[PDB]
Amino acid sequence: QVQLQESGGGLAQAGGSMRLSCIASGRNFFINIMNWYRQAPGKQRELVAQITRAGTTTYADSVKGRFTISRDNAKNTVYLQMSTLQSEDTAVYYCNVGASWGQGTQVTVS
Amino acid sequence: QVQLQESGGGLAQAGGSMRLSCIASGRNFFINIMNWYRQAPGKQRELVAQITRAGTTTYADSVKGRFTISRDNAKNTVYLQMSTLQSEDTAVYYCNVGASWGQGTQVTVSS
Amino acid sequence: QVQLQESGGGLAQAGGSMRLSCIASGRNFFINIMNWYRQAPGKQRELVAQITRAGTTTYADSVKGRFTISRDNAKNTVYLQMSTLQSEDTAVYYCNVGASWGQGTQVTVSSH
Amino acid sequence: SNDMDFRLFPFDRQQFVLELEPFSYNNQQLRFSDIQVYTENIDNEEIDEWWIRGKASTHISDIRYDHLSPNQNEFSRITVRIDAVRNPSYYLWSFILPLGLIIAASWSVFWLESFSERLQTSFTLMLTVVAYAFYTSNILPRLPYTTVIDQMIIAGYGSIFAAILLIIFAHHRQANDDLLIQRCRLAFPLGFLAIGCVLVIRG
Amino acid sequence: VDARPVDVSVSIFINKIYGVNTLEQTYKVDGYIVAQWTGKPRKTPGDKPLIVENTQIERWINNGLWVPALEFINVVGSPDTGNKRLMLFPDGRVIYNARFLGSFSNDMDFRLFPFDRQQFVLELEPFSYNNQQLRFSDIQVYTENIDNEEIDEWWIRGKASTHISDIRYDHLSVQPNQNEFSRITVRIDAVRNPSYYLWSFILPLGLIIAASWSVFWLESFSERLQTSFTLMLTVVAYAFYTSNILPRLPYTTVIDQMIIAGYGSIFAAILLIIFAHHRQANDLLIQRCRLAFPLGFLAIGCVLV
Amino acid sequence: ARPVDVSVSIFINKIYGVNTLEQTYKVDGYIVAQWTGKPRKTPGDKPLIVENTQIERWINNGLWVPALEFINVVGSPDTGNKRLMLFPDGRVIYNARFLGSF
Ligand SMILES: [Ca+2]
Ligand SMILES: [Ca+2]
Predict the structure, then answer these.
(1) What is the spatial distance between Cα D159 and Cα D162, in angstroms, rounded to a whole number?
(2) F46-60: string of b/e by CB count within 10 Å (b at 16+)?
(3) Residue D44, Cα to own-chain centre: how many angstroms?
(4) What is the DSSP letter of E240?
(5) E134 and E236, same domain (yes or no)
(6) Where is chain E broken, named by the residue before each break, C–N > 2.5 Å?
(7) How far, in Å, CA of C49 to CA of C61, rounded?
(8) B interface mutation test: which of E7, E8, E10, E137 has the most B CBs within 10 A?
(9) Does C80 contact chain D (CB < 8 Å)?
């Protein structure tokens, strides 16, 4: 019962930059791990970036060195800085906390 | 120990109509689902119509659009309004509530 | 530990009648069912007649219509009236209540 | 469990019952042919809280269940009843007897010379009944009704309270100390024993 | 490819209601639970209903028999299940019968003690299956084994309240309406037997309080003041006598208030007794308030009702 | 291998039975634990419910159900009904009623 609200997204030029954000809201909860998932047309869902409460960040090989995951722990807000956007990055990005998911924001790149 | 008493039935002309009713009596009970079953002379007992306490109805495909189930909740009474009767509708109609059954009323549709 | 004491028995006449009786005794017991069994010389022990506290009776097919079981509930006494006797009726008759058995009384039907 | 009535406590008689029945089989499938009960291991002594009647009651009956529906609704039941009588010794000596002496000693208030002594002592007597009511309640079993000992306590409260009224009434009644009504040193014991007798017939 | 819900008929037999725990707001209930539904047909020995008891139930479940868990929502701890059986009919019918003894919870208010009225509730719900999967078609309650007597702690109303509702769990969303569960609710109204508390507690307290008013009938200041301490000591002795027997509660009952009134009446008399002795500048007039105190007490007593 | 992420929900129904000398209290509620294991084929490819005694039979056949201990519990808690909800995608939801002294 933790609500996730994604922000940002849209069109981007191949090799520019785009920033996504996700705010988590609820009553009596505590978040340790916040994730970013993406699903490109036809392909299977994949994990992009994962940030623990302690600051450990992990990325998928396809985005390692291009994407950056940051987070404000107190505000339960996670960010995804997508730099040097390839054309493969065309996907709907989902914000995830445990079993909760965000509505999904489209990120197309020409 | 809920008792079900069926009313109505008998002979009816093909293309005509008929109304079956069933009253449930007892003491410390609460009914949610009231059903109408029927058994042809050489077939198995099939669920005809069903009605929930909220009023949502469900019918067998053979009677959909022709039959209508209604109920008075406070009086624990269920009604089966059979319209545009056919020769296939000739069966013993049973009133059902959980494990309880009505005596069974014959409905003979002739020409 | 219910004690059963059979009475009657011995030589009987084919087409005649014989009456067996059985008294049940003990401390703190209640009998619902009282039975009469018989065991022919080389046959198995079979149930002849049975009576419930309510008085309902049941008989083996071989004795139905001929034998009659009765009881006095208060006196814990059961009776067996063996009428229109036959040679097949020759056996050791046992009074029974649960796992308790009577000593067995020999009934010998003669037609000499 | 059994319906147990402890109103006549500590002279109550109880029935310790055992009811046995097949869980899933009616009397057409499983029936009891006989029941034998043995209680030899139980032997009555003065060291026992309860005394058994010795002759245990046994029965085999058919129970018809209303909620069930050609006679497939009857179950064979065994019922065993053991009559017991409570050993009242401890309660007679350590509870009833000292209570009697306390209530009787409360009547001695009518033997005090002055009104001041009669009224002040009544409060010590009232305090003695309260101290006693507790001593009993702390040991006697918890019940949703009053026993015989509980009624004696109420009579003590009544006797002391009634005495208080007479002690005051006698003083401010005359136009100028009604020491004649104070000669009720006999009316209280009698009037109390009289009310005591009519209370016995209630159980 | 749509699966219709399984209609489950329930019967609850109530044998005993006892062991009310005032602080915990709980009560014990001994009874039977009967649950009937229809599964797939099967072959049984001699085409007759098959009885499967106790341990054998697990062996049928291991081999595929569907037997849903019906949880007592308001049970405190796992109930003590006695004998249990399944009756498997060739037509597919299944009847689950089990004896249970459980501790059940409900919001209980004992402020009007010993004249309080309580509701003994049982809430039954499938543990893992929702409306679209398993719903209760009917509920039958039997309270015959509970008969009203003067030797009973509680007086039960024979008219039991039964209800079948749908519970929506806010923490669920398989998003299109898969968050509603079928619940059976049984409510049994009960009234406490106040006889014991009226005669063994309220009555003697009224006598003690009334007898404390007799302090004014003492002739001297020395007698009145000193007697007030014996009276105060009597209320303390009584305050405990009740506390040792009466149930533990997080609030005051009617008896507790009478005790407080007793403390106040004696303490108020101590003030009057002293005020009258040091007002005597020449106070025999004020000392004669033998009618004022009870009237003032009965007045404040009536407004308290 | 990477760590298994477990999402947990705790439902508190009743807090009672404070024992001052023992510094304990009774808690009645539910514990829900969700994680993802290896995908599986389920009857009709719908979530599969496994209740009570049946859970052990699955664990015996290789289903991973980690024990989650109540650190501050006094004695074994009383577990009521318990179930596993197995999804074809590998998701596993463990649900159990509990009554424990903490
Ligand atoms: Ca002994
Ligand atoms: Ca009763």
Answers:
(1) 5
(2) ebbbbbbebbeeeee
(3) 23
(4) H
(5) no
(6) 173, 282
(7) 10
(8) E137
(9) no
Could you tell me the two tokens for D150? 């509980």
- Residue A64 DSSP symbol: B
Range of the domain at E82: 1-193
Using a CB-CB cut-off of 8 Å, the residues of chain C touching D37 are 28-29
Which two structure tokens, joined as six digits, stand for C86? 């036959």
User: Which of E178, E193, E208 finishes a domain?
Assistant: E193
Please say whether the beta carbons of D165 and D126 come within 8 A.
no
What are D58's two structure tokens? 């046994």
Chains that touch F (3 or more CB pairs under 8 A): A, E
> Which helix (H) or strand (E) covers residue D76, if one does?
strand D74-86
One-letter amino acid at F21 equals L
- E74 and chain B: CB distance < 8 Å anywhere? no
Long-range contacts for F14-20 (Cβ within 8 Å, ≥24 apart)? F14/E76, F14/E105, F16/E23, F16/E24, F16/E25, F17/E24, F17/F101
Residue E169 and residue E216 share a domain: no
Tokens of B63: 């009677």
**Please, which experimental method was used?**
X-ray
CA distance E192 to E138: 31
Q: Are residues E178 and E102 in the same domain?
A: yes
Cross-strand pairs, E142:
E13
Total residue length of chain C: 112
In this complex, the chains that touch B, judged by 3 or more CB pairs closer than 8 A, are D, E
Collapsing DSSP states into helix, strand and coil, what is residue D47? coil
Q: Which of F20, F26, F97, F101 to mutate to test the interface with E (most CBs of E within 10 A)?
A: F97
- Using omega within 30 degrees of 0 as the cis cutoff, is the peptide bond preceding E250 cis? no
Domain count, chain E: 2
Q: Provide, as residue numbers in chain F, all residues whose Cβ is less than 8 Å from the Cβ of A98.
A: 5, 7, 34
Long-range CB pairs of E131-134 (<8 Å, 24+ gap) are E131/E5, E131/E166, E131/E177, E131/E180, E131/E181, E131/E182, E132/E3, E132/E5, E132/E177, E132/E178, E133/E3, E133/E5, E133/E6, E134/E5, E134/E6, E134/E8, E134/E68, E134/E182
The verdict on whether omega for the bond into residue F3 sits within 30 degrees of 0, i.e. cis, is no
Same domain, yes or no: E251 and E284 = yes
Q: Which of F4, F6, F7 to mutate to test the interface with A (most CBs of A within 10 A)?
A: F7
Q: How far is the CA of D38 from the centre of ligand 1 (A)?
A: 15
Residues E292 and E208 in one domain: yes
The separation between CA F31 and the C-alpha centre of its own chain, rounded to angstroms, equals: 6
Q: Which long-range contacts (CB under 8 A, 24 or more apart) does D200-203 make?
A: D203/D7, D203/D8, D203/D148
Among candidate residues F60, F74, F61, F64, the one with its CA nearest the CA of residue F94: F64
Given a contact cutoff of 8 angstroms between Cβ atoms, the answer to whether D110 and D185 are in contact is yes
Interface of F with A in 29-58 (CB under 8 A): 34
Cα E150 to ligand 2 centroid, rounded to whole Å: 8
Resolution, angstroms, 1 dp: 2.6
- Among the listed residues D169, D194, D195, the one whose alpha carbon sits nearest the alpha carbon of residue D182: D169
With CB atoms and an 8 Å threshold, state whether D60 touches C30: yes
Tell how far the Cα of E194 is from the centroid of ligand 2, in angstroms.
16
What own/partner pairs with CB < 8 Å and gap ≥ 24 does A67-75 have?
Answer: A69/A36, A71/A34, A75/A23
- Contact residues, chain A, for F7 at CB < 8 Å: 98-99
Q: Is the domain of E20 the same as that of E110?
A: yes
The alpha carbon of E130 is separated from its chain's Cα centroid by a whole number of angstroms, namely: 30
Q: Does E53 contact chain D (CB < 8 Å)? A: yes
Is the Cβ–Cβ distance between E146 and E14 less than 8 Å? yes
Neighbours of E212 (CB within 10 A): 24
Kindly calculate the radius of gyration of chain A based on its CA atoms and give it in whole angstroms: 13
Can you point out the beta strands (E) in chain E?
A: 6-21, 26-38, 50-53, 70-72, 80-88, 93-105, 117-126, 134-142, 154-156, 161-168, 180-192
